[PDB]
Amino acid sequence: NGNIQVGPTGQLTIQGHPVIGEGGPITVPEGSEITIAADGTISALNPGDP
Amino acid sequence: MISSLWIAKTGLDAQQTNMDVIANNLANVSTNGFKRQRAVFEDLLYQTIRQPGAQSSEQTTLPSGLQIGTGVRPVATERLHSQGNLSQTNNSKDVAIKGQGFFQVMLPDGTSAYTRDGSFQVDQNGQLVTAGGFQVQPAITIPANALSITIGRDGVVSVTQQGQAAPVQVGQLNLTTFMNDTGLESIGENLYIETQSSGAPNESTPGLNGAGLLYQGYVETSNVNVAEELVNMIQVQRAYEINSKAVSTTDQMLQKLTQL
Amino acid sequence: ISSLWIAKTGLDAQQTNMDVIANNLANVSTNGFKRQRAVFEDLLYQTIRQPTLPSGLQIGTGVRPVATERLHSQGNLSQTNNSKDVAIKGQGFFQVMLPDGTSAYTRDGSFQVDQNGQLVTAGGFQVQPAITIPANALSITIGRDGVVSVTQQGQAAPVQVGQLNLTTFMNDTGLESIGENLYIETQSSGAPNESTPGLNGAGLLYQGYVETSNVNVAEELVNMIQVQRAYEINSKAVSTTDQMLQKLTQL
């Protein structure tokens, strides 16, 4: 199930009991605009930045 | 309904506004001092789906990601304030302008408008009015026994009294300049009013401080290029043609989806 | 079933194709607009591992729209007969300053002057570097080298008033469009090169002309015919799968 979700705190969760990647659970900033790679790398843009 | 149909609707509306502007230009040939108007367009939102940056691999970059975009929102109409082609009317009350500058006129409500139209008239009380009694600024009152009027290149308006062997000077006719002629807001009657965009008005006699010169016996024609308007009209009709074609295509797509 | 969803992916691909075509066709007569094209890309392939074998069997699923690339070619010119307006020969953009302070890039020439004389672009955005026209300017002259000057009443010489610099990009395809005929810099575009027009790979400037959009309408109409037929084909696939499943669940 790749239906990933972002919580208000920024904790990536396929349905709660969150997702694990390169260590423990992954966390992203609150301003997600997340894009996920062709090989998993997760990049984020704060929605009002260059 | 479909992302396609809203986009095509915006395109049709843009072509319709463009045709409105062309029709207003084409109708206002042979109107003195009219300024050709032209619409400047502007594309709407772009729904970003994949960020054009956003490195895909640990090394790659994903150039030029997926973004769709909508709409053709018309953003402005610029007015071309170029000198019209003067015409020899040989009329003693018709005065044209060569260069920047606008006649100032007192609206009956007490506010001042600006007109590039010297098709003047003299009413009961002797005032110079302009096709509607709009009394100019500053007031110029012809004496009731004056015979012939003249308006020098410098705006000095003087009349020939009866019996008096001299052109006594009656009034002074000055122009006004705006540091953005285009930003004036037209209110009809061949009149413009000051807005925030035009900026403060600088009133001065003709010639001095950037204003033009005044030519009696001439009238300024509309700077509407007939061939330009005609080719614009052909091009607009074909663009409308094509956008309605896109609307119909989306309709066929949707209908085939329905009978599914 | 699998057929139903891969046909849905095909339908979505054709629909995004039509969206691009419609935005293209509507944005004709938009100055400096650059035609866009959608590039598609097939999704995962299922491998059915066999129990030699000159070709394995792979079922494959659907299709995904992978990109939209903007054709940054040179558009035809239009004689606006307006002193303010300017057009670009070759590569380059006019940098503009947004209200927030970040710089955008527009390859549009419909300039104006506001009450403060700043050369602004139909929407109030101040071009960069700033050019301030003096109060009673009789004319504006913009050479092909970009330097802009005015002629004052009483003076027999053009008092030079500014320099209109262009900006070139490594990959101007990769710029992100933010509407309003504006683009902004991205990771994929590289740093801008702020250069004098006519030099260092920048284009030249034409006064009194505006660049028309490079949208080829005949190509768009033929593409619309393709899109309609392809959508109807994929809808046929969806319907056939629906009939198949009807007969399956009947038994």
Added chain:
Amino acid sequence: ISSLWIAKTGLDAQQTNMDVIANNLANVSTNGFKRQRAVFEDLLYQTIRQPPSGLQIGTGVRPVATERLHSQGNLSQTNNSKDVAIKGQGFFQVMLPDGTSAYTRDGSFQVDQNGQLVTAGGFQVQPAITIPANALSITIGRDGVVSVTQQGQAAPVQVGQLNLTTFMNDTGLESIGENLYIETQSSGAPNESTPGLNGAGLLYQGYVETSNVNVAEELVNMIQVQRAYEINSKAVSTTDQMLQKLTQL
């Protein structure tokens, strides 16, 4: 069953939208008509409780309003000395036969048998303006002062002032047909002003303001409405067939 009712609410919303579109397209070529637009709204939401902390299923859609677009219509020239159109905001005030007052942005005026200025249906304009019995020419200036010209008397006798009325909320007015609006509690009291001052518009004599209906908008809207109707009917048919297969067992 559930989907059946929610899809029926969808069908009803699309039918209301088509009714509005038909009324717009039909009242084209009505002087002073303001095109109407239907604003829809979704109904209440059922919350399934999870033992995020729940999910919402939702039910249908509801037409919540119709706003009238009180823009300025194109003028049309009619060569009629009584017809008047309005530049900008404002409404003519008329007196209904019962005694109350309605407001019309329609200036196809006439004079009845007693010289009173009435409005194509016989409602007296306000204030009472009565043309003299032997009028040659009637002039209505931009400031609303209506005057006539008598025989040989080389001076226009002022015969009335044709005021306008402006509202705090143009859209709040309810229309009672016959190109008439009457004040509602959502509109606020009328502000009776002379034309051209205090926000009211000017008057153009010999011109009638046309409807501000955009027919290209309405044809595209009809495309959307027909496709949406067919789509919701498709959903209804789907639910119906599911109920087939449910009751077969």
